[PDB]
Design a protein around this ligand. Structure first.
Ligand SMILES: CCCCCC/C=C\CCCCCCCCCC(=O)O
Length: 279
């Protein structure tokens, strides 16, 4: 029989070489910059979108992939007779996973669609694990259950230096219980069960450092499988966090610029820590 094929979306943050090595298909979102629509696939060069967003007259606007695009990719991918497992960013952030469900129903292909409950490198954990097992010839039930195990041992922490992109883009509606009379302020949230939960907020330049010290304390008694760090803007703070965190995980930490889809909604000088604990 034909190996299962893994699909995800371009909100995933992943080393490009791993996409090829694992035969992962990435369905691109799009972003409109000063009324010109770019495919996210053309916005992967380091720092390119950051510069565009710094200079554009308008805040960019992100768009999910069309239903019909998923239908056509699913139809092409199944020509080998194999099943498809599509793992996507949370429905709370984007309609992408729902467009995939609809594309699956329109296709003649045998398509399973899974909401990762995250995005960025936390979505990467599930997609990579799925594709590794797919490559080994595992069946759909075995892959789904291992992906779920990964999801359920994953945590996502995100810091932003302004609220304005979250407000304008709308995903502030997913932040539970945040009260700020200021947009320009530092906030650290945990994405848990499709909600952004504020852990702390503050104007000061030490708001992230003190939170980091608390995270590190909490890691003393945890077995950690993988940590990834993502950022928008410069990588200075991300590299600093890596220096403190690398001691807590054997696997080398991936420090990656987040994609245009995320940058549009977080703003510059944002960061994420994506942790996967041992199952
Ligand atoms: C700096 C890296 C941040 C990684 C974690 C990001 C998680 C939550 C923050 C909110 C992100 C919202 C993304 C919205 C994408 C919407 C795409 C669409 O138009 O459907």
């Amino acid at each position: 029989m034909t190996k299962i094929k893994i699909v995800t979306d371009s909100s995933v943050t992943i080393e490009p070489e791993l996409v090829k090595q694992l035969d992962i298909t990435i369905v691109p979102l799009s972003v409109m910059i000063d009324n010109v629509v770019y495919s996210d696939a053309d916005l992967k060069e380091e720092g390119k979108f950051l510069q565009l967003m710094q200079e554009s007259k308008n805040l960019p606007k992100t768009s999910q992939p069309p239903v019909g695009v998923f239908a056509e990719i699913f139809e092409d991918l199944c020509k080998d007779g194999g099943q498809i497992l599509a793992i996507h960013m949370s429905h709370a952030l984007s309609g992408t996973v729902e467009a995939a469900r609809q594309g699956a129903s329109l296709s003649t292909a045998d398509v399973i669609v899974v909401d990762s409950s995250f995005t960025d490198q936390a979505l990467k954990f599930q997609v990579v694990e799925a594709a590794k097992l797919a490559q080994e010839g595992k069946d759909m039930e075995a892959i789904l259950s291992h992906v779920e195990e990964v999801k359920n041992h994953t945590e996502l922490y995100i810091g932003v230096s302004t609220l304005e992109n979250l407000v304008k883009g709308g995903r502030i509606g997913r932040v539970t219980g945040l009260l700020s009379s200021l947009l320009n302020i530092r906030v650290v949230m945990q994405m848990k069960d499709h909600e952004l939960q504020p852990m702390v907020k503050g104007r000061g330049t030490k708001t992230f450092k003190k939170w980091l010290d608390e995270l590190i304390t909490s890691l003393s008694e945890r077995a950690v499988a993988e940590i990834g760090i993502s950022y928008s803007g410069s990588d200075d703070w991300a590299k600093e966090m890596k220096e403190s965190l690398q001691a807590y995980v054997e696997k080398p930490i991936s420090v990656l610029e987040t994609g245009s889809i995320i940058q549009t909604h977080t703003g510059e000088n944002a960061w994420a820590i994506l942790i996967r604990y041992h199952s």
